[PDB]
């Protein structure tokens, strides 16, 4: 039985407040923390902020916390919904809010209760979280699938000070045999990258962006990718490490065109590209570099551009801001054949149940699912268990630097150890990890 639900303010990896929920049962105290985006899609569920300029730069979550303690908590404890019944838990929370985008209580009030419930349920059932999440999602556990980590080792766009427009340049050690091997390889590439970056661009270029990637002040993707290819070679892992992008192109979409200098106030609008221009450009990057995944190559509502590009892309295309982990918007994307992978962010939609439905809808359409952190992360490690539970075969959760990233990657080490011979590493088959 749930005896207590309680929310507090804690700090995320950027030093901004976010919501922590504790759910108490006879099995103990279960804690979940809400992450926070920077390049947030306009269609994400409401992140409720206080907007008091005199506290926390206006980024307080006191109102969200209050909604937990004063509205959700009394009703939820009164109800004593079976924590194992995740559907009912989230039915309760969603109906309590009663709005489309969780704008009454806030998605960052609801999500912590949603997640903490699932932790309590796993403990009641005497199983690891990932196993409960497998149960919840009706996912195969024989064997489990461990994910390829997509490691954002070079940070751009809104995550790092500098010219570089494209938000993320990820390495994916698909050629590794185990998760632990993938993570060692990833770390080695990263450290070689850091050294090369500092030599090429100066020492302070070795300081890191929000997600732990190095942050050289460079203008072009080709520069970035050269760095990374050099780093892969230097670490000795040629052929075993591939590349993924997050363009986050909504962040530089304007007037129906795309500005690859968006962080420059003096941006020359005469250099702003177009839908086809951008697609053909992507094609050429894909020709010259071992890129196996591109995310948000076009803007969050630019459906026709997505559709046209997908026709001929030939690699995994990930929807992030396009779909915002929302089954409704995923349905559209599926119909239009705009993408073939979902980026899963639980706090884009605000409950576990809806997140699981998003994943299931995606898999059913022959899509992949990459489970994802936000750029504002915490010491919470839920998504490590989530990506294994959901059997997706791919996660992105940072560079191998800053422990809001390592916390997830370390937890995946632990899960792999526990699973032993009852897991396979997705490797080259990350895209259809669920079908393994």
Hey, what are 167's tokens?
Answer: 């938000």
Q: 64 vs 1, 9, 21, 79, 434, CA distance in Å?
A: 24, 9, 11, 21, 35
Task: Point out the catalytic residue in the list 59, 131, 194, 345.
Answer: 345
ω into residue 143 within 30 of 0, thus cis?
A: yes
326 forms part of the interface with its own copies (CB under 8 A): no
From residue 302 to residue 321, what is the string marking binding to ligand 2PG with x (rule CB under 6 A)? ------------------x-
Secondary structure of residue 45 in the 3-state scheme: coil
Q: Do residues 317 and 246 lie in contact, with contact meaning Cβ atoms separated by under 8 Å?
A: no
Residues annotated within a binding site: 159, 168, 246, 295, 320, 372-375, 396
Of the residues 20, 188, 210, 246, which one makes contact with Mg ion according to CB under 5 A: 246
Where are the extended beta strands (E) located within 309-364? 316-319, 341-344
Q: What is the DSSP string of 230-282?
A: HHHHHHT-TTT-EEEEE--GGGGEETTEE-TTTT-TT--GGG-B-HHHHHHHH
CB of 156 to its own copies, least distance (A): 11
39 binding ligand 2PG? (CB under 6 A)? yes
Which of 161, 256, 276, 366 is the binder for its own copies (CB under 8 A)? 161
- Contact call for residue 373 and ligand 2PG (CB under 6 A): yes
Residue 277 engages its own copies in binding (rule: CB under 8 A): no
Residue 283 touches which of ligand 2PG, Mg ion, its own copies, none (CB < 5 to 8 A by kind)?
none
Which residue in the block uniquely carries the two structure tokens 């270029």? 205
Residue 428 annotated in active site = no
366 scored as a contact of Cl ion (CB under 5 A): yes
User: Is residue 178 a contact point for its own copies (CB under 8 A)?
Assistant: no
Would you give the end-to-end CA distance of the chain in angstroms?
A: 37
Helix (H, G, I), strand (E, B) or coil at 401: coil
Pairing of strands 28-33, 17-25: antiparallel
Task: Tell me, yes or no, if 417 is annotated catalytic.
Answer: no
Please, which residues bridge with residue 25 across strands?
A: 28
Closest CA to 289 of 355, 352, 226, 216: 226
Number of residues forming the site for its own copies (CB under 8 A)? 55
Instruction: Report the site for its own copies in 60-89 (rule: CB under 8 A).
Output: none
* CB of 363 vs Cl ion, minimal distance in Å: 7
Q: C-beta of 26: minimal distance to Mg ion in Å? A: 39
Place of tokens 């209760």: 113
Taking CB under 8 A as the criterion, the residue among 1, 57, 79, 364 binding its own copies is 57
Binding residues among 261-290 for ligand 2PG as defined by CB under 6 A: none
- As annotated, the active-site residues are 211, 345
State the residues that interact with ligand 2PG by CB under 6 A. Answer: 37-40, 211, 246, 248, 320, 343, 372-375
Q: Which residues bind its own copies (CB under 8 A)?
A: 8-17, 20, 54-57, 160-162, 183-184, 187-188, 190-191, 198, 202-209, 212, 215-217, 236, 263, 377-379, 399-404, 406-407, 409-410, 413-414, 417
């Amino acid at each position: 039985a749930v005896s207590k639900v309680y929310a507090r303010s804690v700090y995320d990896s950027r030093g901004n407040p976010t919501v922590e929920v504790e759910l108490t049962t006879e099995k103990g105290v279960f804690r979940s923390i809400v992450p926070s985006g920077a390049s947030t899609g306009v269609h994400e569920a409401l992140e409720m902020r206080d907007g008091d300029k005199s506290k926390w730069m206006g980024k307080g979550v006191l109102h969200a916390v209050k909604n937990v303690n004063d509205v959700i908590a009394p009703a939820f404890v009164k109800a004593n919904i079976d924590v194992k019944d995740q559907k009912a838990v989230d039915d309760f929370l969603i109906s309590l809010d009663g709005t489309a985008n969780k704008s009454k209580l806030g998605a960052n009030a609801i999500l912590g209760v949603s997640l903490a419930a699932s932790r309590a349920a796993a403990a009641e059932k005497n199983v690891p979280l990932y196993k409960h999440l497998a149960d919840l999602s009706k996912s195969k556990t024989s064997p489990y699938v461990l994910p390829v980590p997509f490691l954002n080792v070079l940070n751009g766009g809104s995550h790092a000070g500098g010219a570089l427009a494209l938000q993320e340049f990820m390495i994916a050690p698909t050629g590794a045999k185990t998760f632990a091997e993938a993570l060692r390889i990833g770390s080695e590439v990263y450290h070689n990258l850091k050294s090369l970056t500092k030599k090429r661009y100066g020492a302070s270029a070795g300081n890191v962006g929000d997600e732990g990637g190095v942050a050289p002040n460079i203008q072009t993707a080709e520069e970035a990718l050269d760095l990374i290819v050099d780093a892969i070679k230097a670490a000795g892992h040629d052929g075993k490490v591939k590349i993924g992008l997050d363009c986050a192109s909504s962040e530089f979409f304007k007037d129906g065109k795309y500005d690859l200098d968006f962080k420059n106030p003096n941006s020359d609008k005469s250099k702003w590209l177009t839908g086809p221009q951008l697609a053909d450009l992507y094609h050429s990057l894909m020709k010259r570099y071992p890129i196996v995944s591109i995310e948000d190559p076009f803007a969050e509502d630019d459906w026709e551009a997505w559709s046209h590009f997908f026709k001929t892309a030939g690699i995994q295309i990930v929807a992030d801001d396009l779909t915002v982990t929302n089954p409704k918007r995923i349905a559209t994307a599926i119909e239009k054949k705009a993408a073939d992978a979902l980026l899963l962010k639980v706090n884009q939609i605000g409950t576990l149940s809806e997140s699981i439905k998003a994943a299931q809808d995606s898999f059913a359409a022959g899509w992949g699912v990459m489970v994802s952190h936000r750029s504002g992360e915490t010491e919470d490690t839920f998504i490590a268990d989530l990506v294994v539970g959901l059997r997706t075969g791919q996660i992105k959760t940072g560079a191998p630097a800053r422990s809001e990233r390592l916390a997830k990657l370390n937890q995946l080490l632990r899960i792999e150890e526990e699973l032993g011979d009852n897991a396979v590493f997705a490797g080259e088959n990350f895209h259809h990890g669920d079908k393994l």
